[PDB]
Design goal:
Length: 358
């Protein structure tokens, strides 16, 4: 690898791992479009299995980027419109608070305060309908952003309905396969278990638990190689041969709402480049709190801006992930770890690496 990439990555990540007590980590840097990989530590401490370029990590909420792109692809296919009422796709949602809530609102956390989680007690399709029928919004649609798995998760479920495919089958056929993400999974097959890292929480080995709308909000597992290829695809969508997927990628990076210095896409979030990273490390967008923030509608949405810092953080109980990229510079990073550690530390390390290389 180029020595400058080797050095900035090792010098940044080695102390991160020590400070955060991360058992295992994989990093990819995409530099002038090409990937470079780094690994440390253990995928399974007890079995002494190292992290490799084939180790699967739980992406947690980085999964929302896949959901957003899949939704984008459905729009491009003419199957859904973001301006459609939720009730077009779920007519059983008859309760009156749903009037005026569109697929856009679901996808962008702007429906009026949908809850962070679908409750664990929701086990069936009837339970899920009851949950959404009984939810009482805090605010009118399109007024505040409040991050929510129940919002984008429902978007993902509805977005695939016209296709006639399960969410998983749609994701596989329409996103993973065309992009050659052959080691990316919603459900880890038995054959891949040897490669599936354990997550570590309070020193205990853990994997994410099943839950309603898990696949749609937090349920993808992938390798550092597939995640680098996901970054490459999002950096340079015009190289994608499947036109609806190319268009879908672009739609996911469109800017729909602004709060402070951040713009909400479909799954992806964006800041104008050059960035001052204070807001994403120390300030309002550092993800430490669950924050209700007023939004300004971008009417119409700005097409994907090349001079952006495009990113998403994610975690599960045992994992912490981060992806960021800058299309104009052909530059990006993926950081996958098998411990959940604070988001500001992730962003600070990513910034240190990409700011050095840009
Ligand atoms: O657990 C699914 C999903 O939800 C998030 C928040 O988006 O984490 C929540 O759930 C965890 C498991 O119970 C909690 O430990 C955590 O405090 C909570 O916010 C994601 O991190 C996770 O993938
Ligand atoms: C981002 S857009 O082009 O769809 N414009 C919108 C979207 C939603 C609203 C709202 O009030 O809910 C207003 C304007
Ligand atoms: C602190 S939390 O566990 O609720 N996780 C969050 C909360 C909010 C956001 C956001 O994008 O606003 C992201 C992650
Ligand atoms: C077509 S769009 O996506 O830009 N959405 C808009 C545009 C304008 C207005 C308005 O009230 O002026 C509202 C919503």
């Amino acid at each position: 690898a180029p020595q400058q990439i080797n050095d900035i990555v090792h010098r940044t990540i080695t102390p991160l791992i020590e400070q955060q007590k991360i058992p295992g980590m994989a990093v990819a840097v995409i530099y002038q479009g090409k990937p470079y990989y780094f690994t440390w530590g253990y995928a399974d401490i007890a079995k002494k299995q190292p992290v490799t370029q084939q180790t699967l990590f739980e992406l947690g909420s980085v999964s929302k980027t896949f959901t957003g792109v899949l939704g984008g692809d459905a729009i491009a296919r003419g199957e859904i419109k973001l301006s459609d009422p939720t009730t077009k796709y779920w007519p059983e949602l008859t309760a009156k608070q749903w009037n005026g809530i569109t697929l856009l609102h679901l996808a962008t956390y702007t429906a009026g305060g949908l809850p962070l989680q679908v409750p664990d007690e929701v086990k069936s399709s009837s339970d899920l309908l009851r949950f959404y029928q009984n939810w009482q919004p805090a605010w009118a649609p399109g007024t505040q952003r409040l991050y929510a798995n129940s919002s984008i998760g429902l978007f993902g479920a509805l977005a695939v309905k016209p296709s006639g495919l399960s969410f998983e089958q749609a994701m596989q056929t329409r996103v993973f396969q065309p992009l050659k993400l052959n080691h990316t999974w919603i459900n880890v097959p038995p054959a891949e278990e040897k490669n599936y890292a354990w997550g570590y929480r309070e020193g205990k080995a853990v994997h994410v638990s099943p839950g309603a709308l898990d696949a749609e909000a937090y349920g993808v597992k992938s390798t550092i190689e597939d995640m680098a290829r996901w970054v490459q695809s999002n950096l340079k969508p015009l190289d994608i041969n499947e036109k609806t997927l190319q268009q879908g990628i672009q739609l996911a990076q469109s800017r729909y709402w602004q709060t402070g210095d951040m713009y909400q896409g479909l799954g992806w979030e964006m800041l104008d480049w050059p960035v001052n990273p204070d807001s994403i490390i120390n300030g309002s967008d550092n993800k430490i709190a669950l924050a209700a923030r007023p939004v300004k509608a971008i009417t119409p949405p700005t097409p994907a801006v090349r001079a952006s810092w495009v990113h998403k953080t994610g975690a599960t109980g045992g994992f912490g992930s981060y992806v960021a990229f800058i299309p104009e510079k052909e530059l990006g990073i993926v950081m996958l770890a098998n411990k959940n550690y604070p988001n500001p530390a992730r962003v600070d390390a990513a910034w240190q690496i990409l700011n050095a290389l840009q």
